Amino acid sequence: MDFRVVGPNLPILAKVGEDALLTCQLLPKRTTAHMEVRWYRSDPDMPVIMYRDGAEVTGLPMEGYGGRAEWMEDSTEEGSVALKIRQVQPSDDGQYWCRFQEGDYWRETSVLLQVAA
DSSP states (O other): OOOOOEEEOOOOOOOOOOEEEEEEEESSSSOOSSSSEEEEESSSTSOOOEEETTTTTTOOSSOOHHHHHHEOOHHHHHHHHEEEEEEEEEETEEEEEEEEEEEEEEEEEEEEEHHHH
């Protein structure tokens, strides 16, 4: 009950082949060294990409998924975050959940993104 993420963000419209912007608002306790943030593409079972210890996971070299998604921090800088995803498609069209994980307690919320087809 010490962390909360909200999805007040308005629907995002990006055309197929154009990049999209996933966004949600979270409040870090202090230093995101141990904080983890996960985004899901209409599939909570598997995360597309994650942000941990102030860095996004790249895994193996020439990352297809990691390469596709790059973190773009919001201008407001009030605990909000945004993730830039390249070459959107109908599969992207839908909802994405942000997952704030710290210690043994975490919370998540959906963000509205509707890409043009």
